[PDB]
Amino acid sequence: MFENITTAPADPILGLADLLRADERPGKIDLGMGVYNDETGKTPVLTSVKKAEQYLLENETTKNYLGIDGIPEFGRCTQELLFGKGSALINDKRARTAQTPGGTGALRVAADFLAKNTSVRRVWVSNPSWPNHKSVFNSAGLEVREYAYYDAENHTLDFDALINSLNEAQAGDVVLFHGCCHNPTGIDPTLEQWQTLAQLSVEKGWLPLFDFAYQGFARGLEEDAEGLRAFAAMHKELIVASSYSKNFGLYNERVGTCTLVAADSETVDRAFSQMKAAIRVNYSSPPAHGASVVATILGNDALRAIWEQELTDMRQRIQRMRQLFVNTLQEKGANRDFSFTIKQNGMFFFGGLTKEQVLRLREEFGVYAVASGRLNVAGMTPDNLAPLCEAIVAVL
């Protein structure tokens, strides 16, 4: 059976781990996949998380199955994080949330749900976008089309091009939006632009699908939810996929959610039953640990206080790092000005390097970054900043 099977091409993000693993050079700088690193270059488990874990260790009395949608408390806490304490969706009971295996599992579940329960055929993804988006939707059988977003020249959001290209999007099409910290550009639409998109969306009849993987990394939990909320106020239906991998540093515990919003509770329930069926035939029920940790923290005011402060520290370190980054590039003699990097939200740097420039970086300097020219700023430390900037300047 397996004689003619072809070797699958390496993942553009995950594939870096292996190349890196095989590179015996000591001064390796890993700026590839988007995980947070502290000043020492380690990606530690948050103190709020450890505390939640001791709590679980001491009070967990069973490991019995979780129920297709997972921990109820977890689902409710995420709904308020997303829609807000007194959201109409919560009080009208128009939203049903399922605990999933990470943000990716959330996208896969939505896709399987859509592909088999609605007439959705096309999904619109921004150009550029997280590489795995196309893959996830295509494996579900959906056609993926792109819409303009980034302006390589001005390093901004080309709003007109976006609007124009989305005019080809027909009613019933799914349009995928990054909630905040757009991966990989880091350019997000203003609240005003979000409001314009919301109304255009309702008018054209698109089915909004929000991908929220970095809530709290741009400005703050609530502020980062602004776009979605402007959308949640005018739409009858929505799908929201979120991740807690990054904002809770629980990458490998696979914590995420998939929320369905419908005109009313009766419809959301019928629709949700089909999403649970799509889950049962995939992984059955979600992993408890990571979500328990999230529900405990969010549910306990003391632990929540520590957590929110940890997130704040994470965001602030990245902000300081990208500023220092630009400054060091200046003193190292960088021919090109990288000031725009400062206007980018999240963990990444994008727009100043070419595919060949990044190949040369790993090739002779051992600096690893995504081939698209995307660098993980959250991976730069005061110690590696200088060697890093010297390599980049030698490449420009």
Place this chain on the structure above:
Amino acid sequence: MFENITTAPADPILGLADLLRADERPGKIDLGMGVYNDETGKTPVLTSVKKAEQYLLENETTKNYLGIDGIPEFGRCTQELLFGKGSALINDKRARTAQTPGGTGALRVAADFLAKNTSVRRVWVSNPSWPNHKSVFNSAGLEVREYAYYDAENHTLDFDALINSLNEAQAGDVVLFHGCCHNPTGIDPTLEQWQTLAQLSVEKGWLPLFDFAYQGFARGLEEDAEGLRAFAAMHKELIVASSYSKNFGLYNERVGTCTLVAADSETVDRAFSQMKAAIRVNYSSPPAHGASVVATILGNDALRAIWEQELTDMRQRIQRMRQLFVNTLQEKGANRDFSFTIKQNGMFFFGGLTKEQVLRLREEFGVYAVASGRLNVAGMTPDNLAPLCEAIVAVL
């Protein structure tokens, strides 16, 4: 979009949780889904597990992503549990194992892998079988056909009918086998019958797919692996899906594996790259916690000793319970003799009740069991045995 969506029918196993949840009657007896209960009717977290968890709490220094296939140590430990310490497959490097979200995730990953990378169109499942088997394969696009297995009259394995029906299975077809403790019959083929199936399999050109969810619940870890090993000795290719939900009591942490066996390391590697691609587009990487707990136990001889003893206790309690069950039914005046139940391996009782008899049981007695007449013996306790037998006798 969601206006015409139909309500999905409740799961035959998982659906019991909800009915049960809505039944306010106090003397409810839950003999539905297959989870272990101790003498007190609780499904506790094993002591070996708690200890592994404290270890992790104290020594885990990061939560960084796990890599598509998961924890390497975990993969190796499962290979020896399955194939044996000095298995040829291990030493010739013909097997590649991926950590998955439970046994169900293992079946789904294999199915997606098969559907898109080979010419597999049909999968043969026993009659009867775990209900979710058909669903998993159908959602991947594969046609599912059944083969005879159980003899409702004699309460045995109708080996000739099985052989006969499998003659319709063509080369290149996948044939699914339960490693041990066949769900729901509890009837497993003798080692001699396994050897006959292995040779017939090689001769006809079937692609064996083993589902191992109860290793250690029939006779012992090694003994329960006999069938698979007789198959692993003659086959060039195989697929094995296993679960640690039941034998480690880690139901909600979603711990399982999907192992690929090929003629050689070069082919298994090409094939495995495609399985990782199928994973990346599903949930990306597996949940660490549950598998870490399994790798720690299996990797530490002291913890392993405690664990193996806990499994032994679990198996022994079920054995005592089904014997006491038959005995109590005798003294309660059961018209029908249920001695055959004693020849069944695993957690279940199957073959003595009809769909209506089980409906009447929940209906007026509050005894919950699967509509197929499958009862979870591991859920019977000395306390509920009497009330349980009185209801059954009142129903016969």
